Design a binder for this molecule. Sequence first.
Ligand SMILES: O=C(NCCOP(=O)(O)O)c1ccc(OC(F)(F)F)cc1
Ligand SMILES: O=C(NCCOP(=O)(O)O)c1ccc(OC(F)(F)F)cc1
Ligand SMILES: O=C(NCCOP(=O)(O)O)c1ccc(OC(F)(F)F)cc1
Ligand SMILES: O=C(NCCOP(=O)(O)O)c1ccc(OC(F)(F)F)cc1
Ligand SMILES: *Cc1c(COP(=O)(O)O)cnc(C)c1O
Ligand SMILES: *Cc1c(COP(=O)(O)O)cnc(C)c1O
Ligand code: NA
Ligand code: NA
Lengths: 257, 257, 396, 396
Amino acid sequence: MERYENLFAQLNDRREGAFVPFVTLGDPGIEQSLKIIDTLIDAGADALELGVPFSDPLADGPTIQNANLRAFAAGVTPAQCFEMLALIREKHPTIPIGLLMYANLVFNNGIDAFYARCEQVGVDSVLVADVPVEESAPFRQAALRHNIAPIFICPPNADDDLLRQVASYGRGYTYLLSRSGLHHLIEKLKEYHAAPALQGFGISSPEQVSAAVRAGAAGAISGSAIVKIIEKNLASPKQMLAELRSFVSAMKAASRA
Amino acid sequence: MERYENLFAQLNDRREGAFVPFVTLGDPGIEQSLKIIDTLIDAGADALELGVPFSDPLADGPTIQNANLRAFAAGVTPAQCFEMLALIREKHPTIPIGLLMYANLVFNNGIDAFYARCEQVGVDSVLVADVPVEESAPFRQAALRHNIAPIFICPPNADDDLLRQVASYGRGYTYLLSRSGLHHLIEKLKEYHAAPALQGFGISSPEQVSAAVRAGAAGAISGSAIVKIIEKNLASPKQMLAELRSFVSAMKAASRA
Amino acid sequence: TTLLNPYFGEFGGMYVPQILMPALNQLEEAFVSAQKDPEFQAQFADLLKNYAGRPTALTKCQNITAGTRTTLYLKREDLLHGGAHKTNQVLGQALLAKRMGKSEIIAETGAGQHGVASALASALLGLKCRIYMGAKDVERQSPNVFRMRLMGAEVIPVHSGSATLKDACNEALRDWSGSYETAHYMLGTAAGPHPYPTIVREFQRMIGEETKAQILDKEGRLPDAVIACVGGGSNAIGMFADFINDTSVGLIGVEPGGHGIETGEHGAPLKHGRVGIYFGMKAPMMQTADGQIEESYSISAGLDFPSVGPQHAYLNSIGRADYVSITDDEALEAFKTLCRHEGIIPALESSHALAHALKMMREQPEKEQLLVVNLSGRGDKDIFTVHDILKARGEI
Amino acid sequence: TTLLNPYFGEFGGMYVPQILMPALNQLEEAFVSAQKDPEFQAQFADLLKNYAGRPTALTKCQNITAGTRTTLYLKREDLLHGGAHKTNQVLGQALLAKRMGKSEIIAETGAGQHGVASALASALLGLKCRIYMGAKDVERQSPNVFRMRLMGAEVIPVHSGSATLKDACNEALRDWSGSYETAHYMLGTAAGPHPYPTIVREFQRMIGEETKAQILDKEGRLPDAVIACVGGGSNAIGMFADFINDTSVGLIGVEPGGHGIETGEHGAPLKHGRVGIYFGMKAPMMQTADGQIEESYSISAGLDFPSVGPQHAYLNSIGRADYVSITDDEALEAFKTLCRHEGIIPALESSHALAHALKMMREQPEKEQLLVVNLSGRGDKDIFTVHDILKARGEI
Ligand SMILES: O=C(NCCOP(=O)(O)O)c1ccc(OC(F)(F)F)cc1
Ligand SMILES: O=C(NCCOP(=O)(O)O)c1ccc(OC(F)(F)F)cc1
Ligand SMILES: O=C(NCCOP(=O)(O)O)c1ccc(OC(F)(F)F)cc1
Ligand SMILES: O=C(NCCOP(=O)(O)O)c1ccc(OC(F)(F)F)cc1
Ligand SMILES: *Cc1c(COP(=O)(O)O)cnc(C)c1O
Ligand SMILES: *Cc1c(COP(=O)(O)O)cnc(C)c1O
Ligand code: NA
Ligand code: NA
C-alpha cells in the first residue's frame, strides 16, 4: 500500500501538518488500549505509532518504560499485539500505522517472517529503535520486500553522510529527533529527497506542533504526553478517554492552516 | 633462718618424708584462706607452698587458674598476700613457707626489694615459675642476699648439665617434676649435693607420697588435689575445712615410717 | 563505517540507537590511536605493575592433583589489586577516557565487583565516577556499595524494570547518550556493542601473555588446556587471547549451570540459549520463546550476565574453544577443595573453572595433562554465602 | 647457653618455665641451620614468589601528597596472599617445622589474622594446624574463624581467663610444652621468648630488602623515613631491618593511641608502658602499678598486643628508631583518605602508619621528604567497623 504517501499528499493539499500520537499496545490492558486507539483516531490523529511491549526498552524514558510494565502486568504478548493490529486496521482502512520495535522482537523468529506478519495485518512502517543505519541492511531489505516502510531516526547533530544515508534508506517518513538523550536538518533532508520529516521527542503542546510545521517538518509525533494521560487516569477509564480526546483535538488543530 | 634444713634433718631422724600442700593465697577470700592454711598445718603439713594471685598463670592447670580467679574476685593483691604471710609466720614460727611466683610480680618494683620483703615477713623460699636457670642469676643472687632459698624445677628429662646447674643454684629443696605439660634423677641430684628433692605435679593420693619417699625423694607436694577440695565446697566453708583436714592427715600419714 | 571489524563471524555488531553511534565511533578511534601510542602503553604498563601488582603469580597446585597424572597451575588474578581481574581493564579504560579529554566515568554493576573496580580506577586517576546499580543489588551487596562510596563514587540505585543488572546497564546507556562529550561509559565485560568486546579483550590479554611466559619458564611447553569461567567473557578471553593461534592449546570456557541445565535455572546461554539481539550485540542469550530477555541464575552473582561476549560465541562456532557448565554444587565443592588443600580461597566465579579442571582430573586420573585454571578472583567476599549454604544443609 | 644472643640490650630473653627450654633451644638450632642452608632458602623464596606473590609493589601516592613537598610510597603488603604481611613469616615457620620433622602446628590468634595465615601455610604444606582463640574473639571474629576452618585448621575456643589473646597465648604454650616433639608453636609476632623475635624479623626482612631496591630504582636514593605500625612488631621490624645500618634513614614505629594516651585507653606500651617480664620476655608492657598485665585498646584489633617486641624497645632506647602514636580518629581519617584519593582500602592497622605520614606532610608541607609507609594489610575486613562508626556519629 502507500498509506503514508497518500496521507502526506492529502495534508499538503490542505496545507496541513500531521499529528501522530504514540501509545504502547495493550497499555493498560487490551480492551482499554483498543478504546484508547479508537479515541485517538476519532479525535484527529493522522497516523499512529504503536509500541510492542519489550522487557528492556533502552531508548525510552520513564513514562514509556512504565507503559510497557503496565502492559506486561496485563499479560500482553507480541502475538496479542498483532491480533490488535489486525482489528485496528479492519476498523480504520486508511490511517498509516507504524510500529516502534526493539531488534530482538523483530529478529526472534526471523526478520523476514516479522515483516511478513506486519504486511499481513496491514502495518505500514517499522522503526527498530536499536538498529542504527550501519546495521540496518537486513531490516530495511525485508521491510521493502513486504511493502513496509523502514523508518530511521535522524539525530540533531547528524553529519552529512548520515543525512544522505537516512534519506536514501528510509521510506514513509523520516523521524527527526528534537534532541539527544532545526532548519538545516529539514532543508538538507529535502535536498536529498528524504521521506517527509516528522519531529518527535518532547512534543507536548499545540505551539510545538505549529512550530514544527513552520520549520518545514511535515508534522509532529507525541508519546510521553499521551501516555502520561493514561498513567494519570488509570482509576477512571472514562475520564482517560475524555482527556485523551481533548489533548489530541488540540494538538491536531495546531497542525491546520 | 634455716627452716628447711631444720625440717629435713628432723624428718630424717624420724625416717619420715615431708608432705607439702600448695594453695593460692586469698582463695576464696582472705579470712577463709587464713583458716584453710591453719587447718593444713594443724592436720600435719610439714611446709607450705603458697601462690600469689597472678593475672596469667602459664605454668598452671585449670584448677589453680580458677583458684587465682577466685582470689581476684575477692580483691586479693600482692600487698594483701604479704600481710597474710606475716600473720601466718607470726602464728607458726618454724614451718617452712615457700612462695610460688611469676616473674613480673618479683621484678615489678625491683627484684631486691621483693626478696627483702620476703625476708621481712619470714618467707623461706621462692620458686619463680617462668624463670629458667638460664635467666635466674639476678633472682637467685637477690634471694641468697636476703636469706631466701631460690627453688628450681628439675624436669623429668633433665640432661646432665641441667642437673648440675639445679644442684648448684638451688637451696631449700629441689622441685622434682613428676612430668611435662624416677631414681636416676633422684640419685644424680644426691650425687651433685642438691637440695633435698620434693616431688610435685599430679600428687593426689597417699600411695603416691609413700612411693615418692621410697624412690628416694625427701617428700611430696600436692596442689590441685587440695585446691579441688576448696573448689568443691565453696558453699560450705565448714565442710571445706573438715575435708581438707581429712585429706592432709591421710597424705601426711603416708610419709611416716 | 568502522576502523576495526565489529563482528566475530555472525556475532557482535553495534546494535544501539543511532544517537549512540558517535560515542562508539569516537571510542573506537581513540582506542586504535592508543594502541599505537608507546606513551599510552607505557603509562598502562606502569599502573599495572606498580599500582595493581602485575605480573600475578602462576601457582602449581600439587596437593590437589596428588595421585593423578594432572599437573595444575592457577593463574593468580586473585592477587591483583581489588582481588579480581576486572582491575586490569578498568585501568586501561580510565586511561582511554583521559585520552579523549573526559573527566567523568559511568559504570554499571550487578554483584558490585565491576562497580568497585571502576571506582578505584576513577579515584586513582582523578575521574568523577557514577555507578548504576539495580536497587535489588544495592540492597543485596551492601559491602561493595560502601566500598564504592568510600572511594568517592556516586552510587545510583536503579528502581526501574526489575532493578537488577540489565536495568542498570540500560540506565547507564541512557545517561551516556546525553553525556558522552564529557563522560566515558566503562562497560564491565567483553560484551556489548563494538568496540567494547575488542577493547576489553585487549586490556585483559596480559593474563594469557603472562601465563604463556610463566608456563614456558616452569614446564618448557604450553598447556594442554587453559580453563576459565564465563559470565560475560572478560577473564576468559583475557586468558585465551594469546593462545588462540597455538592450536594445540585447548580453550575451555565454563558457564554457570546453576541448579542444573535441565532445571532451566542456570546461566549458560552460549550452549543453552538462543541467538538474539540485545545489550547492543548479536549473541546467544537467555530468552523466552517470544524474545523477551530473561535472567541467568547462579550461586555466583558475578556470573549472572544472561548473554555472553560475541568472540566466545564465535570461537565456539568454529570449534576453537569448547564451552561446558558447572553447577552450584560442583562450584561449592571446588571452593572447599582449594581452601583445604592449597590454602587459597577462590571466588565462587573462579570456582566454576576449578571445578571443571577437577572433573578433567578425576574422570581420567591416569591421563597426563597440563592444565591452567584462571583464578579470576579471591573468595573472601563469598564466605558468608558458602557458610549459609553449608549451615542450611546440615554440615557445619 | 644459646647459639644467638637472646637480648637486645636489656630487652628480650627466655622467660619461660624450665620445661619449655628444650623446645626453644631445638628451634634456635634448627633456625641457625636453616639460615645457612641454600636449599631451605630456595624453597622459602619459591613459596614467597610463586604462592604468596612476592615481590610486592611499591606504589607512589601522588594524589595524597598534592600541593606539598612530600613524596610518599606505600609498600604493598596488602597485595600479599592473605592480604597482610603475616603470610611471609608463617611460610618460613612452617618450613622450619618440617625441617625439625614435625607434622603439627599450634598457633594463637586474637583478631584472627595470624590464625588465618597459620591455617593457610599449614594447608599448603601438609601440616595439621590447631589454633587457640579466646572465646570473646571467636564470637567477635566469625569471618576469620570460618576461614580457618575452611582451610582445615582446628579452632579451639579458650574460655579461661578473660577469653582473649593473652589467654590463647597461654593455652598455646601449655599445649606446646607437652607436644613440642611433634608440634611446632607458630608464634605470630616479633615478640615472645628467644628465638621468636629474631626468627620473625628474619622471615619478614624481605619487606625492607625489596623496599630498598625498589626505592633506589625509582628515586636513586634511600628514603628519609620508613614508617610502620607496631602491634607486636613484626611488619615494622620487617620493614626496618635492612635499613638499620643506613643511619640517614629514619625508622618510625606507630603504636595505637586508641581514645588518646591521656585516657589510658590505648595500646602504646613502648612509649607509655613500663618494663616487665611477661609473654616470655622482658619488654615494655601495659600493667597495673602492682604488676598485673592489662589490656591494650585500639579501634584496630590487630594492634591489641599489650606489649611490644624487644628489638623495638632496644632500637628506641639507643635512639635509632622513633616511636609515636596515632589515635582511632586519626587512623580513621587516614583510612578514608587513602580510599578516596588512591583507590586503596588499607587495613586499620596500616592506617595508623599512614596517619603519621599524613601528619609529617601536613604539619610541614614545604618540607622536602621522601617517605615510605608499610601498608601491612588490606582493609576489606574493616569496612563494617568503619561503616558502623561513621553511621553512629551521624555522617553517612
Ligand atoms: O516515538 C518515540 N517516542 C514517542 C515520542 O517521544 P516523547 O513524546 O518524547 O515520548 C520513540 C522513537 C524512537 C525511539 O528510539 C530510538 F530513538 F532509538 F529509535 C524511542 C521512542
Ligand atoms: O607446685 C606447683 N603446683 C602444685 C603441685 O602440682 P599439682 O598438685 O599437680 O597441682 C607448681 C610448681 C611450679 C609451677 O611452675 C613451674 F613448673 F613452671 F615452675 C607451677 C605449679
Ligand atoms: O555484564 C556486564 N557487566 C558486568 C558487571 O559486572 P559486576 O559488577 O561484577 O556485576 C555487561 C554490561 C553492559 C553490557 O552491554 C550493554 F551495555 F549494552 F548493556 C554487557 C554486559
Ligand atoms: O601478639 C601475638 N600474636 C599475634 C596474634 O595475631 P592476631 O591473630 O592478628 O591477633 C603474640 C603471641 C605470643 C607471644 O608470646 C607468648 F607466646 F609468650 F605469649 C607474644 C605475642
Ligand atoms: C565479574 C567476575 C567474573 C565474571 O566476569 P567475566 O567478564 O566473565 O570475566 C569472574 N570472576 C570474578 C572474580 C569476577 O569478579
Ligand atoms: C597483625 C597485623 C598487624 C600487627 O602485627 P605486627 O606484628 O605488629 O606487624 C599490622 N597490620 C596488619 C595488616 C596485621 O594483620
Ligand atoms: Na553469561
Ligand atoms: Na603492642
